[PDB]
Amino acid sequence: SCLIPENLRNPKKVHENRLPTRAYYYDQDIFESLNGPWAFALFDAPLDAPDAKNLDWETAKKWSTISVPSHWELQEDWKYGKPIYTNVQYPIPIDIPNPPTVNPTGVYARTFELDSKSIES
Amino acid sequence: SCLIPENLRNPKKVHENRLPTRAYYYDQDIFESLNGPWAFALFDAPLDAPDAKNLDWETAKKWSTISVPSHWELQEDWKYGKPIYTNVQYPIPIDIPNPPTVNPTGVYARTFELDSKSIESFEHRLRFEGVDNCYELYVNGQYVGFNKGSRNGAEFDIQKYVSEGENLVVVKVFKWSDSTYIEDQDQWWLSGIYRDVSLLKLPKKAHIEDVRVTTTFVDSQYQDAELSVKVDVQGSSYDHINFTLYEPEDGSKVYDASSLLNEENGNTTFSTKEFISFSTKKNEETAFKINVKAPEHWTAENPTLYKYQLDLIGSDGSVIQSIKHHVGFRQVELKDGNITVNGKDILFRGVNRHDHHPRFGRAVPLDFVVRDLILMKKFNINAVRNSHYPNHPKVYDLFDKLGFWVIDEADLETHGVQEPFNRHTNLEAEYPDTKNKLYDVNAHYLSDNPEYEVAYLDRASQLVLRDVNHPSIIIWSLGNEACYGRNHKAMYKLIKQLDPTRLVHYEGDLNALSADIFSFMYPTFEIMERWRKNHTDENGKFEKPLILCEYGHAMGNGPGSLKEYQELFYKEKFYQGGFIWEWANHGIEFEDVSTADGKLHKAYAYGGDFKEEVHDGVFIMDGLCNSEHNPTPGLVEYKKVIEPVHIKIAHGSVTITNKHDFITTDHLLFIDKDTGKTIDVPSLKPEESVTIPSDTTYVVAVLKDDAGVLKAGHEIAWGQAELPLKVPDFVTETAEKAAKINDGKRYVSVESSGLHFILDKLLGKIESLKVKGKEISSKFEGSSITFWRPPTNNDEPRDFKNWKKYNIDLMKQNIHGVSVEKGSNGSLAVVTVNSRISPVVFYYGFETVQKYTIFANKINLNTSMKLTGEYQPPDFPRVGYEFWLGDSYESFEWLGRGPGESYPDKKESQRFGLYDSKDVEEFVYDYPQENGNHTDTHFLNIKFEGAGKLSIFQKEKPFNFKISDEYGVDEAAHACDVKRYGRHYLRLDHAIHGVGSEACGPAVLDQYRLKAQDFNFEFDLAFE
Amino acid sequence: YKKVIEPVHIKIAHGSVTITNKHDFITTDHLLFIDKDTGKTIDVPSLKPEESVTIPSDTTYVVAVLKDDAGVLKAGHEIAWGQAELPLKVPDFVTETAEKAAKINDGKRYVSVESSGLHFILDKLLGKI
Ligand SMILES: [Mn+3]
User: Fold this and answer.
1) Domain C6-94: which topology?
2) Chain B residues within 8 A of C74 when measuring between CB atoms
């Protein structure tokens, strides 16, 4: 299935380059929040989303913003769709391990500042 | 119970002071109509109604008026309530024999004038043709009597009560009574004086009270017959009776509404073509038996009648009274196990006909009844069952004159006793061979209840004695779905005593312990066949035959498989046909708020529309004709399956078989439709056939001359040679044209001279296909191949439940790969789409390959659908493409079945030919559902303005198609609720599920079910 | 046509109902006059052809209706009616004039105005919403 990206239909692709899980401790001196408004655009499926290897901030600057954290089905005026409630039944067809081809894809973008000392320290 | 009057809760109080039932004859000189506006008031219950012994005309004058006849639930602005529809369930609590305490009571009042001479010259009676549910009657403030039996008549002697000058008639009518329990027909509950009221003036000193006419053949060869005329004369002052029989008028006699309904007259000379004359002598029996030399037979196929005049004569030799009626020479017997008329084992080509009019209800104008019967005759029907009560008494001459085998049925249904039982035991299904054991449980309440015997006998006595003299009536029926009990046995004994000349029917009596006939309703072929075999002995003899008093439930799109029932009827002498249920939808006209429009529109009401507490919804709409009593595709199909002549064309031969019971084919003109010249067909007797060598494809059997209510040229039967599927001679442009192929990230373009093809690769959707000015695109919601149809009434109870359960309405196309290559053998390009078509929630679905081979003037679409996965549905409604048609679209034309719609098990009436959409009024169902499909389609041409046609054909097999405008059909309650797009679509189908009759009867038969399986099919979209 | 030829005139102005009989022969006796604002009936004197009466009233809408079934007409059938003229009243709609942040995007061809619960797009080339 070349109309569905390989990583969305591979049960073994649990992650790529994720660090090993460790015990959680919040530390104010280490943690720096990136919450707030992010550039955001929603696409019908992966193939409509831009290549992120070529996405400028100059390009993404022009998008509407969404606030992190939040679900995109819970925005002012249901802008990016509405919630779906199912109990037992899957809301998709069962064709393990394939997701549906039409697969809502949201691209988030924001920037942050880094010091000369920061990268060294 | 002193809050309920005694007579409304006494099963034995069938009437008070009603005269004995006599044979009905309308006489203009005796009958004086009291129809018109009456003073009327409605009261909550009997105790609020005035005492009629004290009601002045001066008081009643001040009330509003209502017009007689009419139901009071059918008035301007629903002034006195609305109709209630229940099928089985009683609309009251069951507390036999009590009616509800709150019991709508309508008091009618009017006056009439009486002369000094009138009271001296005449005996005065009041005759009420029908009042629902029951009533007490008052004249000049004096109680006359009481009556029960809504569809029966009643006469009361009024002589004691009348004065010179003004006379006051007051009728107190009650909605409910102990009688309600036996009046539970599946129909509208409607009240009031809904039939004619008359003042009868009979000659005082002597008059004819009753007449009995019988015709018995003397011989086993049915030639000479004994005519027996017995007269009951009341009074002393007469000398004798005269009788004149006139020369017969052949059943081929031409009638219309006007001549059928002409009621004249006093000075009108009945006839003068004398045949036999008889006189009685002074002081001798006013009866006689005459031998009649080889008379013309009365038959439903040829309703030949001898008019007669019976005269009562005084001492001075003057005529005191005349009866002008007719004799039909006919004998019905149970002979060698068959219902026999004149020695012939007949076949019922029948319907059940209720009294119904979309505005007046059960108060049907005779004009409208005539309309019904003409239509029946126009559609090859030869019999009617009076479901489930006698009609207006004037209707029976109509049967006599037009020719129908009639089952006249007692006004008695008890069905509702079963409803609490059905619900308590969670009963899913009843079967004709076993269901009697279920009814046996509750028979004790009414049909096996001694308290009701008097009532049950009265229904029988009233039925038989009013209509005894109509040759059209061959069978009396004890009622309908009333269980089985001693009361039925009592009815049977009485009817045989009263009238030995006819046979008795009662379907509730499975083993016909007190009936002469076996009867099933909605049986399966297997069930019919079990019964046949268990009642035919080793020698091949059966004691009694089988009819289907109800079958082929005609509700909505359907009934399917009328063909298979018919094949069975013709194969076994033991089966003698059936009566389909029903003649017409019971829809009542009303103002509906539109779900499409937000505006008010005329519609036809079924259960729920009048906001009943309890109702049975759309089961009102179960006719071959719609609520306006016009033919549906059901009636069109029925006419074809029952056609009384078979025409088979094969191997350069036309075989014609006469399938009438009595008549020859002489009245028929056979036309070779391929040439237009007529075919010389030998005079064929019943069951005779002939093979004639011919190159013909299509032969029609047509009426030579106006006869009965049918016109010269009217089609009776037809046949066609089967038509091989021929590929049209379309020339595909395989010349090499330069073509630009643009395979983008999401969209693929193929552009050439005169051609534009765009496909959305993500969806599998055709965004646009424009070839030579003609444009289509996929009507897309989830999938490019769809499966759903708006469920028919038949689909609802089971198939729909399955289709919904398996989410067939939510089938999705998930694209896996799209392949784009340059054209090969004359081809411009090949676009191949690989996908899975599967609904949300589920595993099952189709591994699908759609190959689009694009030529300059044609698009070949190959579809391959591989059924995969666990937990599959049994069947689908449908399978195929949906396309939006361009703005240019104006009309279509097809080679296939037409002119109307057709479905796998409902198609044969729709002959092959070339059809144009412009020539066809597409059928509008009273209840919106699957419609407009055309099956066995060879090719389809879609015409676009200014750009010619797009031709569409499926390879190697005929296909299915629908072209329409409409949506929201599933949830639209009425025709006016149907939504419409701003453009048309084509539903292009490889296959479609059959239609059946499962709303009440067998499921779609196996060979017509669209079973779950792989689908492979190829279409061409050829552009002119 | 039924309205312009109505055989009774009902005029409502200045707290008064004026009723004029416009029949050629018959009286108004067969008619029931209902104050539609209250539902209670109005006592109207028997008026001969061309006779009229002014009755003080706060009513807006008066109907003249048949008392009893007569001829081919039913009790309650409307013969004539009148209304006081109705001033144009602005509905009591509350316009939200509170300050909401709004994004205005004035593009080359299209202009967008977006706010909470609101979306307005105009094609500047066409003048089309
Ligand atoms: Mn509706």
Assistant:
1) Immunoglobulin-like (2.60.40)
2) 64, 76
